Amino acid sequence: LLNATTYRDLEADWLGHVAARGLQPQRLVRRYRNAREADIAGVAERVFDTWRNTLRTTLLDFAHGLVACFAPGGPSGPSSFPKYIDWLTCLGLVPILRKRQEGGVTQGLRAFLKQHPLTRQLATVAEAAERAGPGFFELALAFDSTRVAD
Amino acid sequence: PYYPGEA
Amino acid sequence: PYYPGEA
């Protein structure tokens, strides 16, 4: 998810935030009208810190939203991991069975992504999700297709 | 104004 | 601009 992002959209979003506040450098310096550069620099730094923290928490929330779809498939259902480990511990073999089809994980991914609002809210997240989506769908198909025999 | 994670 | 790892 993080790797998908790009600089231009992030800069555009930061500029949009500044414009929405109306707190542009020229207006702020014209407002204060003093040469105490350290104070204005600290004010700007704290503004950017607020924006950065909000972005961090937003992205964390979305990322946790994505992870929940895959996690339940690992421990149980097709491709269960403890079954693999006990297969290894008993014989060293691991019989597998395969069919290509779309199942629960792909449906969950499809439902989650098309509804989520952060895609509309942030262009950066929109592009990142659009780029990362296909890989998520391939990985979900990988989860759903394979089964470890009983 | 606007913020990146608000409704 | 441009960057090494961007698509």
A17 vs B contacts (CB less than 8 Å): 1-4
Contact yes or no, C with B (3+ CB pairs under 8 Å): no
Can you tell me the distance from the alpha carbon of A42 to that of A144, in angstroms, rounded to the nearest whole number?
52
Closest CA to A21 of B3, C6, C5: B3
Q: Among A3, A7, A131, whose Cβ lies nearest the Cβ of C3? A: A7
Can you tell me the distance from the alpha carbon of A82 to that of A105, in angstroms, rounded to the nearest whole number?
19
| Min Cα–Cα distance to chain A from B2, Å | 6
Q: Give the E-state strand segments of chain A in sequence order.
A: 96-98, 146-148
Closest CA to A118 of A48, A63, A53: A63
Write down the experimental method used for this entry. cryo-EM
The crossing angle, in degrees rounded to 10, of helices A37-70 and A7-21 is 120
Closest CA to A145 of A101, A94, A95: A101
In angstroms, this model's resolution equals 3.6
Percent helix / strand / coil, chain A, rounded to 5 = 75, 5, 20
In DSSP notation, A96-111 reads EEE-----HHHHHHHH
